[PDB]
Design a protein around this motif. Structure first.
Motif, PDB file in Angstrom:
ATOM      1  N   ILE A  11       0.824  -1.203   0.000  1.00 50.96           N
ATOM      2  CA  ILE A  11       0.000   0.000   0.000  1.00 50.96           C
ATOM      3  C   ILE A  11       0.862   1.258   0.000  1.00 50.96           C
ATOM      4  O   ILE A  11       1.721   1.435   0.865  1.00 50.96           O
ATOM      5  N   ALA A  15      -2.275   5.864  -0.553  1.00 50.94           N
ATOM      6  CA  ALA A  15      -3.328   4.871  -0.378  1.00 50.94           C
ATOM      7  C   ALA A  15      -3.609   4.622   1.099  1.00 50.94           C
ATOM      8  O   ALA A  15      -4.755   4.411   1.495  1.00 50.94           O
ATOM      9  N   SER A  39     -10.806   0.270  -4.899  1.00 52.28           N
ATOM     10  CA  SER A  39      -9.789  -0.441  -5.665  1.00 52.28           C
ATOM     11  C   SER A  39      -9.458   0.302  -6.954  1.00 52.28           C
ATOM     12  O   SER A  39      -8.301   0.348  -7.376  1.00 52.28           O
ATOM     13  N   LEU A  42      -8.034   4.037  -5.556  1.00 54.13           N
ATOM     14  CA  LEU A  42      -6.702   3.920  -4.971  1.00 54.13           C
ATOM     15  C   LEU A  42      -5.740   3.209  -5.923  1.00 54.13           C
ATOM     16  O   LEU A  42      -4.527   3.226  -5.715  1.00 54.13           O
ATOM     17  N   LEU A  44      -5.556  -0.030  -6.430  1.00 52.74           N
ATOM     18  CA  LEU A  44      -5.052  -1.219  -5.754  1.00 52.74           C
ATOM     19  C   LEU A  44      -6.002  -2.399  -5.950  1.00 52.74           C
ATOM     20  O   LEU A  44      -7.214  -2.215  -6.068  1.00 52.74           O
TER      21      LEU A  44
END
Length: 67
Positions: A11, A15, A39, A42, A44
């Motif tokens: 991360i 984030a 998701s 960010l 991710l």
């Protein structure tokens, strides 16, 4: 000829800042739409969100002291 810095992992800083605030504002109970949006926002994966919240979920349970 240079070894004094390593790429960011687990991360990103940006984030983590937004993720941490999400818990303080929302909590530790995200939804399918929450992860899909976070998701994508960010940038991710999905599992990264489940592990993050899941892990923190135990932090409050196990440890009996905040701050």
């Amino acid at each position: 000829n240079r070894q004094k810095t390593r790429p960011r992992t687990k991360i990103s800083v940006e984030a983590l800042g937004i993720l941490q605030s999400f818990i303080q504002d929302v909590g530790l109970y995200p939804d399918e739409e929450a992860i899909q949006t976070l998701s994508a926002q960010l940038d991710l994966p999905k599992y990264t969100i489940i592990k993050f919240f899941q892990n923190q979920r135990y932090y409050l349970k196990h440890h009996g002291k905040l701050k």
